[PDB]
Amino acid sequence: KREHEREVIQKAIEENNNFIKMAKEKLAQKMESNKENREAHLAAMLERLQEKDKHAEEVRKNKELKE
Amino acid sequence: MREIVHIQAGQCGNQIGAKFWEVISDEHGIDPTGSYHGDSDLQLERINVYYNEATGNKYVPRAILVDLEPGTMDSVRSGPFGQIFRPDNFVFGQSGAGNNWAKGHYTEGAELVDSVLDVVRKESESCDCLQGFQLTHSLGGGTGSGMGTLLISKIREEYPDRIMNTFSVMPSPKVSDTVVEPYNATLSVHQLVENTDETYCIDNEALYDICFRTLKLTTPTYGDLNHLVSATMSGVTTCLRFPGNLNADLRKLAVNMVPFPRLHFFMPGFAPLLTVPELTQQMFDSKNMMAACDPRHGRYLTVAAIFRGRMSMKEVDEQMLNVQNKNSSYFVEWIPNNVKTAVCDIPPRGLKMSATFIGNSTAIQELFKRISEQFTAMFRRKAFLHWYTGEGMDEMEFTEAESNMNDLVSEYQQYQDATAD
Amino acid sequence: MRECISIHVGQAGVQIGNACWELYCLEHGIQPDGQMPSDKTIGGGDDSFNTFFSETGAGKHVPRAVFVDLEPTVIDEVRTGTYRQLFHPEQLITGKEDAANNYARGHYTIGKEIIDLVLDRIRKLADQCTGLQGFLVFHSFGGGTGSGFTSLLMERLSVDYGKKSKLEFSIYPAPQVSTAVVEPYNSILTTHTTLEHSDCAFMVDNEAIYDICRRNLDIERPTYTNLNRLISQIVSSITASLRFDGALNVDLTEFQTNLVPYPRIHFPLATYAPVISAEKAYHEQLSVAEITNACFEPANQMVKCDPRHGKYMACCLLYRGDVVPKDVNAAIATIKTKRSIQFVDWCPTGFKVGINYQPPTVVPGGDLAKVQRAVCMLSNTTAIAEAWARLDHKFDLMYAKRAFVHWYVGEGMEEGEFSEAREDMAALEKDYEEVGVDSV
Ligand SMILES: Nc1nc2c(ncn2[C@@H]2O[C@H](COP(=O)(O)OP(=O)(O)OP(=O)(O)O)[C@@H](O)[C@H]2O)c(=O)[nH]1
Ligand SMILES: Nc1nc2c(ncn2[C@@H]2O[C@H](COP(=O)(O)OP(=O)(O)O)[C@@H](O)[C@H]2O)c(=O)[nH]1
Ligand SMILES: [Ca+2]
Numbered sequence: 001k002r003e004h005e006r007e008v009i010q011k012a013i014e015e016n017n018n019f020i021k022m023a024k025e026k027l028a029q030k031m032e033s034n035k036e037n038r039e040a041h042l043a044a045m046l047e048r049l050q051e052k053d054k055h056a057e058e059v060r061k062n063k064e065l066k067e
Numbered sequence: 068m069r070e071i072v073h074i075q076a077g078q079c080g081n082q083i084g085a086k087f088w089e090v091i092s093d094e095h096g097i098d099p100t101g102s103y104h105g106d107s108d109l110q111l112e113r114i115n116v117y118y119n120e121a122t123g124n125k126y127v128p129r130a131i132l133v134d135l136e137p138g139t140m141d142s143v144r145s146g147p148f149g150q151i152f153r154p155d156n157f158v159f160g161q162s163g164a165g166n167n168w169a170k171g172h173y174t175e176g177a178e179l180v181d182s183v184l185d186v187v188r189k190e191s192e193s194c195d196c197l198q199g200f201q202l203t204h205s206l207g208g209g210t211g212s213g214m215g216t217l218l219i220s221k222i223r224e225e226y227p228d229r230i231m232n233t234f235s236v237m238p239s240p241k242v243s244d245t246v247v248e249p250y251n252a253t254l255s256v257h258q259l260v261e262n263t264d265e266t267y268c269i270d271n272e273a274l275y276d277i278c279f280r281t282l283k284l285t286t287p288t289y290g291d292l293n294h295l296v297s298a299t300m301s302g303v304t305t306c307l308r309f310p311g312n313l314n315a316d317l318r319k320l321a322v323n324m325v326p327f328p329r330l331h332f333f334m335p336g337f338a339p340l341l342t343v344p345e346l347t348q349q350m351f352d353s354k355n356m357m358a359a360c361d362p363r364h365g366r367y368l369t370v371a372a373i374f375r376g377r378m379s380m381k382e383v384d385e386q387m388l389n390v391q392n393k394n395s396s397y398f399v400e401w402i403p404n405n406v407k408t409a410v411c412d413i414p415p416r417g418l419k420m421s422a423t424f425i426g427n428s429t430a431i432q433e434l435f436k437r438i439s440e441q442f443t444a445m446f447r448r449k450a451f452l453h454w455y456t457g458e459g460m461d462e463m464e465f466t467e468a469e470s471n472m473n474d475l476v477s478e479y480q481q482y483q484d485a486t487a488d
Numbered sequence: 489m490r491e492c493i494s495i496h497v498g499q500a501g502v503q504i505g506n507a508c509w510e511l512y513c514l515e516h517g518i519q520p521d522g523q524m525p526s527d528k529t530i531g532g533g534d535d536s537f538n539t540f541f542s543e544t545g546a547g548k549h550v551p552r553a554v555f556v557d558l559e560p561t562v563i564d565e566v567r568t569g570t571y572r573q574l575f576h577p578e579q580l581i582t583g584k585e586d587a588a589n590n591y592a593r594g595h596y597t598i599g600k601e602i603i604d605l606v607l608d609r610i611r612k613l614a615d616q617c618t619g620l621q622g623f624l625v626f627h628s629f630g631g632g633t634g635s636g637f638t639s640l641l642m643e644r645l646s647v648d649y650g651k652k653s654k655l656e657f658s659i660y661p662a663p664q665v666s667t668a669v670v671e672p673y674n675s676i677l678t679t680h681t682t683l684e685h686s687d688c689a690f691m692v693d694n695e696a697i698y699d700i701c702r703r704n705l706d707i708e709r710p711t712y713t714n715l716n717r718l719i720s721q722i723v724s725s726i727t728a729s730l731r732f733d734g735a736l737n738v739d740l741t742e743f744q745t746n747l748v749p750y751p752r753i754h755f756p757l758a759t760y761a762p763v764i765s766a767e768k769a770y771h772e773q774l775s776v777a778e779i780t781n782a783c784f785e786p787a788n789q790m791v792k793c794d795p796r797h798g799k800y801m802a803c804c805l806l807y808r809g810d811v812v813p814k815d816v817n818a819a820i821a822t823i824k825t826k827r828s829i830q831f832v833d834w835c836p837t838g839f840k841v842g843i844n845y846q847p848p849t850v851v852p853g854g855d856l857a858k859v860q861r862a863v864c865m866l867s868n869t870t871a872i873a874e875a876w877a878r879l880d881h882k883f884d885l886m887y888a889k890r891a892f893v894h895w896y897v898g899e900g901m902e903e904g905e906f907s908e909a910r911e912d913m914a915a916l917e918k919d920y921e922e923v924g925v926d927s928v
């Protein structure tokens with residue numbers, strides 16, 4: 001009976017510790033996945049505007065061809 | 068609090084922008100010398116959204132005036148409230164765009180774009196919490212059309228996480244300045260689709276038709292047209308300027324009005340042009356829209372309605388709920404509760420009650436069909452292309468912008484015919 | 489001992505917190521400067537009201553509360569308001585720009601910039617507790633902060649405080665007073681994320697409270713002040729067992745044992761009576777039998793649903809004021825005949841009763857009349873799933889066209905998070921069907 005009583009209290013401890021652990025890792029994965037996602041969206045946006053500037057350079061060099 | 072940076076570019080931009088600053092300074096009680104002389108503390112509760120506070124408790128508009136020719140900005144500085152503006156915020160060109168998009172976007176405008184960015188960077192760097200940018204311009208000219216859209220793209224590069232809002236003026240042959248206006252508009256619409264969060268379509272055709280059919284004039288000047296724009300621009304920013312809970316800032320307005328990123332072109336409406344039922348009915352009337360489109364020819368994705376003045380806010384709830392039920396088939400089912408209603412106890416000048424309508428309707432495709440039909444009829448013959456290809460442009464840029472606009476109209480039709488159940 | 493820390497998140501949670509802490513002070517005799525002339529133990533003590541108020545040496549009774557909002561506008565009214573001396577500045581935490589009605593901004597983009605500071609301040613409150621019991625989290629479903637930041641906070645509280653009890657007072661969105669078109673999205677997302685981190689959640693349907701104000705108080709167009717003062721009466725009834733004491737005062741954790749048969753079935757239905765105007769209260773006194781009868785009128789429920797369409801798994805009556813058991817048992821005996829109250833077959837059918845002798849009070853100048861006796865009912869009925877169903881249907885309508893989803897994806901979220909959250913709701917709806925089916 002004493003051995004079972006320690007099995008129960010250690011299982012309760014293990015349950016609470018595991019709930020905290022899973023919560024802590026699910027959250028870290030969510031925040032990291034979200035941070036990378038948002039940086040990828042902003043990077044894709046700024047790269048798209050980078051092409052706008054290169055095409056604007058192509059337009060100015062094309063006009064420059066007077067002779 | 069939440070600062071908005073204002074930019075005006077070109078003739079039409081600086082003109083309507085002047086009237087805008089004249090109207091709201093009058094509403095917030097600010098004289099041409101930048102001094103407050105009002106009665107209600109609600110005029111200063113969110114005054115910092117559009118104004119800075121300098122030495123001597125003076126309120127200076129956070130506005131930047133841009134143009135490739137000085138003639139338009141000179142009469143602004145000489146006009147009423149010309150002293151209220153920061154003289155360093157005047158950015159002046161000496162060449163002009165000749166009402167040519169390529170000159171505004173690539174040649175004359177690109178030479179002056181850096182000096183504008185410096186002034187914009189100073190106004191933004193001293194902002195507690197920048198909301199974004201508010202542009203006034205036309206799409207049928209050269210400076211505001213070409214350099215405006217260029218200014219949008221260059222600002223997006225430096226402030227990609229800020230809201231980009233524009234008051235764009237659509238050209239029509241009823242007040243046509245030049246003949247190449249379908250070219251400038253189609254190239255600019257292609258830019259507004261990709262780089263702005265929300266665009267108020269100020270259609271000159273709707274302005275002239277109101278200034279002709281409703282208000283009888285026959286010979287409507289730009290002042291009568293801009294009078295409609297000032298009242299409209301004052302109405303659609305009431306939620307930004309006074310203590311309000313609904314659509315209080317630019318991002319909350321964009322979140323609640325834009326269900327899909329490209330479909331961000333709004334139909335502004337204003338009433339009157341005597342009671343809350345009458346005010347509500349006129350507000351939804353196709354003849355009160357500042358865009359030449361009939362909403363009964365399309366569907367409402369989202370709508371925002373601002374009642375200004377003193378009235379029964381219970382009667383307003385009953386009237387805005389009544390029009391949604393009676394006109395149920397004109398609102399998309401797959402967006403529940405897509406009509407928001409705001410109330411501001413402070414009316415505009417000269418009116419005891421007013422109503423401002425901002426609709427995101429698929430019927431806006433009619434305005435884009437009108438500009439595209441004038442484009443293709445002009446592009447079918449390659450007319451006036453030397454103005455643009457002389458500035459280094461290629462025919463690809465024209466065909467793409469037209470193909471982009473044809474995809475926008477088909478996108479509006481896609482969601483007009485979309486159902487649930 | 490047995491302290492409770494309150495956390496008010498976003499505009500709705502903050503403004504409701506103002507109503508609750510104002511009502512608490514009136515119930516306990518605490519002045520706006522925190523002084524309590526009746527409290528003879530200066531600088532501390534273990535009275536029942538100390539579960540919510542700490543004490544300074546100068547005799548000020550300080551709420552065990554934290555206010556959090558990602559924008560300063562609302563909390564600035566606490567800072568300059570009537571009860572500004574009640575709180576220390578460290579309990580009032582504000583950001584610069586809000587979540588813009590976007591769960592992603594409340595949970596991720598804007599939220600992560602202030603979450604550590606908020607937890608640090610919560611930790612400073614917990615360190616003053618001799619035996620912290622848990623948290624009460626007030627928030628809206630629909631706001632970007634009330635949904636996104638609350639989810640992030642409840643996740644962090646599970647980590648920093650183990651399985652310590654976390655209770656919710658959540659504002660279910662109603663079109664009559666709504667702020668954003670994307671409120672079904674934020675509601676499903678936060679309900680999914682918080683589901684496994686909340687022991688008990690009292691939902692409040694703004695349309696239910698709105699209609700109660702119109703009908704019972706004769707307010708043409710009720711405001712947030714009207715709604716929050718009514719909501720504060722329900723919160724007061726629920727926490728009165730913690731804040732007050734008595735021979736018949738049944739603790740809330742004891743009700744909680746009966747109210748939560750399974751971890752996910754933790755959404756009790758609240759019903760309050762009497763809500764009457766001063767004019768009607770001048771005419772007639774409402775007995776124990778009358779206010780008890782009103783608890784089974786669906787018009788007095790905090791959430792719009794039909795309990796006849798479901799089954800009961802628990803039924804608790806929380807009385808306050810001039811009430812004795814003999815009246816309660818007689819009134820319950822009447823209700824157990826004139827009303828058909830169907831229980832699931834795996835649950836006992838009795839009603840659990842608590843009485844708090846401290847009489848209810850009202851804010852002076854308000855619209856609620858001061859009555860001699862009030863009751864709050866907390867029942868666990870499968871019918872509350874109808875509220876999930878209505879909300880889920882609005883979500884499904886917009887998500888089928890991916891309407892507004894770009895505002896969430898642009899802030900770093902994925903379509904998978906929407907479908908995963910919606911599936912959790914479908915499973916929760918299925919859970920509520922299963923618990924109500926008779927045994928074999
Ligand atoms: N009952 C009640 N509901 C409120 C109150 N304030 C806001 N709400 C509701 O809350 C929802 C909107 O969320 P809010 O709490 O206002 O927004 P928030 O939490 O500050 O989030 P963001 O402003 O987006 O950063 C709507 O359904 C409102 O009806 C209030 O004081 N009382
Ligand atoms: N409503 C309105 N439209 C204008 C105004 N000024 C010009 N426009 C329109 O703008 C178009 C020409 O653009 P413009 O202002 O000349 O461009 P800019 O020269 O580069 O600044 C024409 O189609 C006009 O109808 C104005 O003050 N009000
Ligand atoms: Ca004491």
Ligand SMILES: [Mg+2]
Pocket residue numbers: 078166208244
């Ligand atoms: Mg011109």
Ligand SMILES: [Mg+2]
Pocket residue numbers: 498499586631
């Ligand atoms: Mg808010």
